[PDB]
mmCIF file of C-alpha atoms in Angstrom:
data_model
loop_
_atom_site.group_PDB
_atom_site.id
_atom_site.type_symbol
_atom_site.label_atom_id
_atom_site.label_comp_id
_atom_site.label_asym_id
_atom_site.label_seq_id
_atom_site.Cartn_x
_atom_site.Cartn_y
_atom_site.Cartn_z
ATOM 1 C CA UNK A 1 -81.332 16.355 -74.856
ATOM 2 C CA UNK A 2 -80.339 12.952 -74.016
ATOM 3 C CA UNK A 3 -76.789 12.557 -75.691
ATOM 4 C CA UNK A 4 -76.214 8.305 -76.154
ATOM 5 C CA UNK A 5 -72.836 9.901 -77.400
ATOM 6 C CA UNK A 6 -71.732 10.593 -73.907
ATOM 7 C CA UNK A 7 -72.827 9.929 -70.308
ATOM 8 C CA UNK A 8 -71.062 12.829 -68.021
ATOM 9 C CA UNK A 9 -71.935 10.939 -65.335
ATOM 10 C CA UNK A 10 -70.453 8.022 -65.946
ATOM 11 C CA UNK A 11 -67.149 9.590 -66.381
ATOM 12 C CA UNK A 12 -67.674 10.888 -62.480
ATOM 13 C CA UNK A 13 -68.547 7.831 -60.836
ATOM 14 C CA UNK A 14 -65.172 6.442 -62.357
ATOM 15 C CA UNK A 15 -63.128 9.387 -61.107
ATOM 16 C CA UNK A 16 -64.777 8.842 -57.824
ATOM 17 C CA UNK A 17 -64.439 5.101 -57.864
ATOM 18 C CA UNK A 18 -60.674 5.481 -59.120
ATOM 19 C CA UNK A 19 -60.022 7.325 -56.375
ATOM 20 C CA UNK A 20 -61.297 4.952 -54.147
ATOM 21 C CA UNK A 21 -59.931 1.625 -55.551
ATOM 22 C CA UNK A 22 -56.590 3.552 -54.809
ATOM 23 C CA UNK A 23 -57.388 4.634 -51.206
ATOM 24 C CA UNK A 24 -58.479 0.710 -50.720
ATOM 25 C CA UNK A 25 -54.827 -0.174 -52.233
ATOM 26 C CA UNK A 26 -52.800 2.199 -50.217
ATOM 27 C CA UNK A 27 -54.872 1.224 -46.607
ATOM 28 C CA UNK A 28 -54.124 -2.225 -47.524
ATOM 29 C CA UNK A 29 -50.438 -2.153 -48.054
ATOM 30 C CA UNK A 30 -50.073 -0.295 -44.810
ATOM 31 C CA UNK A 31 -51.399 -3.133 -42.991
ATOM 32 C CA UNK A 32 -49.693 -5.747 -44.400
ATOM 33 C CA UNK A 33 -46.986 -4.058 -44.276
ATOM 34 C CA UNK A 34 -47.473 -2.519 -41.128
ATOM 35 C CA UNK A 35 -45.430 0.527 -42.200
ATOM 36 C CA UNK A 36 -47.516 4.172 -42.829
ATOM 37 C CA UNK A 37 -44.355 5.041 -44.899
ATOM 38 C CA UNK A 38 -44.330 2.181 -47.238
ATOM 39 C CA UNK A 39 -42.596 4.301 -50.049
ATOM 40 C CA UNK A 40 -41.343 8.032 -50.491
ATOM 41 C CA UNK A 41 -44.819 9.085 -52.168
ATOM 42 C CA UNK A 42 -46.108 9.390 -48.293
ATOM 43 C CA UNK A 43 -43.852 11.283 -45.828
ATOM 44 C CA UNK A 44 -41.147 11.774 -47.726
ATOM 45 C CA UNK A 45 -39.640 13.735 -45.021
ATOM 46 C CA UNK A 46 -40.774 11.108 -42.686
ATOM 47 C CA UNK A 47 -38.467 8.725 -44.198
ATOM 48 C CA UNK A 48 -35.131 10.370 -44.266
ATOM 49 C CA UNK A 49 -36.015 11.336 -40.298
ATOM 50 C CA UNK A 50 -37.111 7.315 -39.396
ATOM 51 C CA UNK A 51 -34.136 6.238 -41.927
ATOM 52 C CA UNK A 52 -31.770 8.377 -39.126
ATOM 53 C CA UNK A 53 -33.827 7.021 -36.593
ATOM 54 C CA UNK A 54 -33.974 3.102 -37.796
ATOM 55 C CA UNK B 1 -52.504 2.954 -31.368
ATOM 56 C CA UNK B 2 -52.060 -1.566 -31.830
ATOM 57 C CA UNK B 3 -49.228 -1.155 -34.086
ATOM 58 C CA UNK B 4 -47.198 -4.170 -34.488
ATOM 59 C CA UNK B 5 -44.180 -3.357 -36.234
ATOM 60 C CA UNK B 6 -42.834 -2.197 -32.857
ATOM 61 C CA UNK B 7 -43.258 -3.130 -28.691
ATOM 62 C CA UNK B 8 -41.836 -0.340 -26.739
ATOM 63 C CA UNK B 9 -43.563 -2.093 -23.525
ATOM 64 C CA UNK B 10 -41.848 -5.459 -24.179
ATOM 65 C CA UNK B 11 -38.473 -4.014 -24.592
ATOM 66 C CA UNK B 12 -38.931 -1.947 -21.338
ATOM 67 C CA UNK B 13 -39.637 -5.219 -19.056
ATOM 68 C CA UNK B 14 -36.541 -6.952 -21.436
ATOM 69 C CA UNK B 15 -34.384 -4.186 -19.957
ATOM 70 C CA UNK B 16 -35.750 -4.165 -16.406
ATOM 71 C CA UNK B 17 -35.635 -7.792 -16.991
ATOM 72 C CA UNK B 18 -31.681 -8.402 -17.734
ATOM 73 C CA UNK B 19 -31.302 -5.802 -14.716
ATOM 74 C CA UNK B 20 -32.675 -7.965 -12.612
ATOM 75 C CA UNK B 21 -31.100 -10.987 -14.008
ATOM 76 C CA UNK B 22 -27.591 -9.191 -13.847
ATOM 77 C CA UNK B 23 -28.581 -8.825 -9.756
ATOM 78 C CA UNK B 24 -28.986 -12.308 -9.287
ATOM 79 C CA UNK B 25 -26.088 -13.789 -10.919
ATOM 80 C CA UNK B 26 -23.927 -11.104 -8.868
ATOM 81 C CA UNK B 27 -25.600 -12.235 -5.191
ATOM 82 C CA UNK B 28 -25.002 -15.536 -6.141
ATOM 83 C CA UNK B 29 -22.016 -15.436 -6.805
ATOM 84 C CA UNK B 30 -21.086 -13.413 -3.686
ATOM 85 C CA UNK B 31 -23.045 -16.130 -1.745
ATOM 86 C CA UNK B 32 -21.125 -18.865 -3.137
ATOM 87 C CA UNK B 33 -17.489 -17.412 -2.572
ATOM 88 C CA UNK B 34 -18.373 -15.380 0.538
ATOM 89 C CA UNK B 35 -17.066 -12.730 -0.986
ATOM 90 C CA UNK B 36 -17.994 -9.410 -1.508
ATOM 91 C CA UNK B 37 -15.619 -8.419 -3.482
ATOM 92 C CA UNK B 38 -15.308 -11.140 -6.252
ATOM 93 C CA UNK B 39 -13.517 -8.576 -8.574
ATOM 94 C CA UNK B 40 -12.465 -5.054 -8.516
ATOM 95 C CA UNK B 41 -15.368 -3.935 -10.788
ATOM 96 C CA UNK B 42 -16.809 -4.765 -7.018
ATOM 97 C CA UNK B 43 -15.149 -1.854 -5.420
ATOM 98 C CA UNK B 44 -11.562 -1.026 -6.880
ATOM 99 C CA UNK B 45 -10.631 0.217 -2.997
ATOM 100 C CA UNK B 46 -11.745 -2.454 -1.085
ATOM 101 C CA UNK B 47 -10.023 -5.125 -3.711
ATOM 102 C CA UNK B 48 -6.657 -3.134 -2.633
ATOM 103 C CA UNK B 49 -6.761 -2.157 0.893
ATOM 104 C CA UNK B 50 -8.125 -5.982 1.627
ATOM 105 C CA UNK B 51 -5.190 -7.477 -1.110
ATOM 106 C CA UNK B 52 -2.551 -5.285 1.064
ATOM 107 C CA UNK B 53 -4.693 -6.763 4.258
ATOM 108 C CA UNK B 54 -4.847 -10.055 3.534
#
């Protein structure tokens, strides 16, 4: 019942904690940086309007 | 909210600020001269008729 092969949950907590470590990484590049677009992957159309605007 | 990148207040009061500034360095130099109209950006009119007066 117990399968030492593979522990499902294990694999989830990662995903989770992935997820996470990644959220941490974007929050803290926006405050150093102190730009919410740092790069395209985030309001892409945000940056070709505040390129206009800047 | 407290973002830094940008001061909207400070460059308000900069504005109001050289306005002001602008004021002063006109009144004195109509104080020193006695003149009102130092230069035609003055009053183009006034420069005339009073050039013709004078």
């Amino acid at each position: 019942a117990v399968n030492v092969n593979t522990n499902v949950a294990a694999m989830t907590a990662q995903r989770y904690l992935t997820g996470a470590t990644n959220a941490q990484q974007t929050s803290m590049e926006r405050l150093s940086s102190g730009f919410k677009i740092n790069s395209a992957k985030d309001d892409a159309a945000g940056l070709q309007i505040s390129n206009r605007l800047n």
